[PDB]
From a paper:
The Staphylococcus aureus pathogenicity islands (SaPIs) are the prototypical members of the phage-inducible chromosomal island (PICI) family of mobile genetic elements. The remarkable ability of the SaPIbov1 Stl to target unrelated but functionally similar antirepressor proteins relies on the modularity of this repressor.
The structure of BovI-StlC-ter in complex with the Dut of phage ϕO11 (DutϕO11) at 2.9 Å was solved by molecular replacement using the structures of each individual component previously solved by our groups (4 and this manuscript). Stl provides the N-terminal part of its dimerization helices α11 and α13, while DutϕO11 contributes with the dimerization helices α2 and α5, generating a surface of interaction of about 1100 Å2. Superimposition of the BovI-StlC-ter components of the DutϕO11–Stl heterocomplex and the BovI-StlC-ter homodimer shows that the Stl helices α11 and α13 of the second chain in the Stl homodimer occupy similar positions to the DutϕO11 helices α2 and α5, confirming structural mimicry as the molecular mechanism used by Stl to interact with dimeric Duts. This loop (residues 230–241), which was unstructured in the free form of BovI-Stl, acquires a single turn helix conformation and resembles the DutϕO11 “latch” that comes from one subunit to conform and cover the active centre of the second Dut subunit in the dimeric Dut homodimer. However, this BovI-Stl “latch” is inserted into the active centre of DutϕO11 and occupies the position of the nucleotide. BovI-Stl residues H233 and I237 mimic the pyrimidine ring interactions, with the former residue interacting with the DutϕO11 Q17 and D21, and the second with DutϕO11 F20 and F74. Finally, the interactions of dUTP Mg-triphosphate moiety, which is recognized mainly by the DutϕO11 acid catalytic tetrad comprising E39, E42, E67 and D704, are mimicked by BovI-Stl residues Y234 and K238 from the latch and R253 from helix α13.
Residue numbers in the entry:
A (entry chain B): 175 to 198, 203 to 262
B (entry chain A): 4 to 49, 58 to 88, 97 to 118, 122 to 157
Write the structure that this text describes.
Amino acid sequence: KKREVTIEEIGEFHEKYLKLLFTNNDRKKALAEIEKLKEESIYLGEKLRLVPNHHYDAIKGKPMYKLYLYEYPDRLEHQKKIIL
Amino acid sequence: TLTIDQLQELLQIQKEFDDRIPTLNLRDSKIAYVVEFFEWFNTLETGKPLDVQLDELADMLAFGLSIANQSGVSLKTLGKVYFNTSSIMKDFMEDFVYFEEDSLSLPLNIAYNLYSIDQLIDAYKKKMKRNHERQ
């Protein structure tokens, strides 16, 4: 289990996050993807928690893992609620 | 307001900063940069308050300053015009999915188009002060 987060998976995640926000009226397949996207968010948060992007914390003042562990899941929650 | 060799004031400031960071390396700079592009792209409508946007923008800039700096851009000295937000996507996407120069070109050309460019700089100089202080 290679510990360090790769550039490509990080890239894949945000991409999927953007496709998600473009799905557009019975399409309930978007909700599944939010469930998927929450879980790999946690996946990435934990990896970055154990093995941190150093330069990110120095320039941002906040740990990068938190962005995946907490903020994106918050966001994907916000999209979940917006629904009817 | 649109820039004229403030490359010696930013490449240094950031040079300045990164030297206070022992474990600094290129793979991580690259990732933080990518993360900040999306972080910034997020702050728009594809929206969020103006103040909050160029903060991410400024955050991307610091990483572009590092790349070229860690690349040792040998004295290289491009202003591009962008019609749409999607025309910035495309650009990043091939510099990324199919690949230093463009990485630093990008946060600036946005400034030219999306904003003022002497208006981004004031966010960068402000934070790095708070940052050089923290470290």
